[PDB]
Amino acid sequence: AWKGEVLANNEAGQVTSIIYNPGDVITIVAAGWASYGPTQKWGPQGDREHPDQGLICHDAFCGALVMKIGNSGTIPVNTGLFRWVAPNNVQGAITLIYNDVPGTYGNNSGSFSVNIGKDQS
Amino acid sequence: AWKGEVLANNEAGQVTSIIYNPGDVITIVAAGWASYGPTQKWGPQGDREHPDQGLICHDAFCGALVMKIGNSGTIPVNTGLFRWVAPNNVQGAITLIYNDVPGTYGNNSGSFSVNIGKDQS
Amino acid sequence: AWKGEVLANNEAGQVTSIIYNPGDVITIVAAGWASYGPTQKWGPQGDREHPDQGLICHDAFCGALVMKIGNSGTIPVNTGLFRWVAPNNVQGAITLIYNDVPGTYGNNSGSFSVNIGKDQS
Amino acid sequence: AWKGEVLANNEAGQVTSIIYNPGDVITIVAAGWASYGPTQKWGPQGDREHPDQGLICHDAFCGALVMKIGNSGTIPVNTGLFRWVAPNNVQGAITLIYNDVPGTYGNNSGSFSVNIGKDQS
Ligand SMILES: O=C(CCCc1ccccc1)NO
Ligand SMILES: O=C(CCCc1ccccc1)NO
Ligand SMILES: [Ca+2]
Ligand SMILES: [Ca+2]
Ligand SMILES: [Ca+2]
Ligand SMILES: [Ca+2]
């Protein structure tokens, strides 16, 4: 029920129309190519070779797709989530974000194409 | 309803328990790191810079995840398929395969973790 | 998903654990046999021949299954709802209720078995 | 996936476009009013008070909704089936049928409105 693009250079991330409510089961699929600065591109799992120098999400590689649900901290998405249920006390609008160091989004390029849907529960 | 791994060095691929029937809607999500020979690894979209020297799937990069449905030709999966329906006359077990040149799977390493489910239809 | 029973004699109805949120798609199936007083029994559509003498739901027959979502007005359920979205902006817990005139639940008998699930959206 | 009507007077029943395949989960909801001969009408559970005089389905009341899957024996549907899986070795097109005595469908009237969908598995 949501399809769109998340730009690697967008520090604020892309607000979706999906409101995660308690008990919701969701599926995410992410595709595409992006860079956090170097003259190469990576998919939605990012670059396993790059050290973490203050990423917004310590549980995903630099250049990975991550998300926030309302005011949650960052949650790894990577290539996507299969029939996934959030931790207790997590709810609200899903924001998709490119995993980088705050203040370093200006040299980023490319984007991921993302589908999000609610599953049966 | 199927969860598993597909080994990059398995030329025959991983035959799943999912039988695709006409009208079925499926979702696939793939994650992980694999190599077609080099010391680097790539995610399930593969290596966008490697030329095609006789890949089993010409519509996906070397080192991408692809599939067959029964005895179909290869179909790109990459990071996954969101609520996907097959063409007419495509039916049978889903086989997941690492995209490489026939005869060259021996120097491959790593695997993709894959979830497949049938959706509402 | 929720499975349970609503008694025809319960003016307060049965509060379920299903929270209807905006955009939710739900499926309900209701079965069983109940009476609003007469010696006969009706299924969850109720008695199409009995006049409305002040039913809690004017859009369903006497002895039908109806519901509230949070503090909404009554909504007909009857035998159930197939991949149903609320026509109004309503939200909150689903309460199931037997459709009868307030203060006349004392001569009611029987019950409906009800399954509620959220569908893909 | 399928929405339509089954006439009470149709002895052959109504063939749907739903092919039940092994492993499939289905949901059916049925509504409406029909008769096996009397002036009164009943919902999809039929008439609890009418004796079985050789019904096509001995496990449902006269005037109930029943079905066959391919050439299976009759299976009770009544008001519907919630996330239901068939017994082993039952496969093929779903035919919906009004439960009556063979040869006695000529005096029947009305119809049930029926929705069938495949659920997640
Ligand atoms: O923008 C940054 C810091 C520098 C990234 C970079 C490293 C090597 C070559 C070019 C750029 N992090 O996201
Ligand atoms: O209880 C009522 C009013 C009376 C309905 C009734 C009619 C004939 C025989 C017994 C009861 N409304 O639900
Ligand atoms: Ca950067
Ligand atoms: Ca190789
Ligand atoms: Ca009453
Ligand atoms: Ca008859």
Author numbering:
A (entry chain A), B (entry chain B), C (entry chain D), D (entry chain C): 1 to 121
Provide the authors' original text about this structure.
Besides mammalian CLRs, bacterial lectins have also been proposed as viable targets for drug development, such as the opportunistic pathogens Burkholderia ambifaria and P. aeruginosa expressing BambL and LecA (PA-IL) / LecB (PA-IIL), respectively. LecA and LecB attach with a remarkably high affinity to α-D-galactose (Kd = 50 µM27) and α-L-fucose (Kd = 3 µM28) containing glycans on the surface of mammalian cells causing bacterial biofilms in the lungs of immunocompromised patients. However, inhibitors for the orthosteric site of Ca2+-dependent lectins have been a bottleneck for drug discovery. As result, we identified metal-binding pharmacophores (MBPs) as novel scaffolds for targeting Ca2+-dependent carbohydrate-protein interactions.
